[PDB]
Amino acid sequence: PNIIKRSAWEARETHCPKMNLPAKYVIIIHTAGTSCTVSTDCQTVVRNIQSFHMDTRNFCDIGYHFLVGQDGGVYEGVGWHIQGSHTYGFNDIALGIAFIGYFVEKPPNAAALEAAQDLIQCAVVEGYLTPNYLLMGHSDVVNILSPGQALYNIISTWPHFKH
Ligand code: NA
């Protein structure tokens, strides 16, 4: 897919750690904030995410390698060659792809989903991602207690658990 570069959304220039390529994992994330369905709005959101990550979160740059808007566009975060700040303990081996929006109740539209799969496939073709890469959701990294793990299963039987 034709990637919308940092220059397009007027990203703040930085000098961050380099990425270890090819990446071996793809971690899907959602920004959990507002979505965007037209390019101009997506550029604004991406720019504001970079500012928040840097100024408030103290990250070196925006934490995602790429972001996907519901305009069907793929937006360069830090890109292929820069380390992410999206999932601690995996930022230099995992490509963090974040869907712009909140997708708990509804999924991103077909345009966004297809753009994401196209990006992942292209990553392998170009050598940015290993052909035997592991795809997972943000919560799937083992250090984040999640469903299926022994401890999670036990606390899910405790009072007040999600109710
Ligand atoms: Na986990």
Counts of helices then strands in the chain (DSSP H, E): 3, 5
Q: Give dist(CA 101, CA 151) in Å, integer.
A: 30
Q: What separation in Å is there between the alpha carbon of 149 and the centre of ligand 1?
A: 8
Q: Give dist(CA 33, CA 45) in Å, integer.
A: 9
Pair 130, 62: CB distance under 8 Å: no
Residue 18 backbone phi and psi in degrees, to 5: -80, 150
Residue 144 backbone phi and psi in degrees, to 5: -105, 110
- 88 among the known binding-site residues? no
- 65 among the known binding-site residues? no
Resolution for this model in angstroms, one decimal place? Answer: 1.6
Pair 3, 75: CB distance under 8 Å: yes
Look at residues 58, 45, 47, 52 and name the one whose alpha carbon lies nearest to residue 16. Answer: 58
CB atoms near residue 19 (< 10 Å): 21
- 64 among the known binding-site residues? yes
Strands 66-68 and 74-76: antiparallel
What kind and span of H or E run contains 26?
strand 23-30
Look at residues 48, 18, 22, 20 and name the one whose alpha carbon lies nearest to residue 34. Answer: 48
Structural biology method used: X-ray
Look at residues 70, 78, 68, 73 and name the one whose alpha carbon lies nearest to residue 23. Answer: 78
Superfamily classification of domain 1-163: Peptidoglycan recognition protein-like (3.40.80.10)
Q: Give dist(CA 35, CA 49) in Å, integer.
A: 12
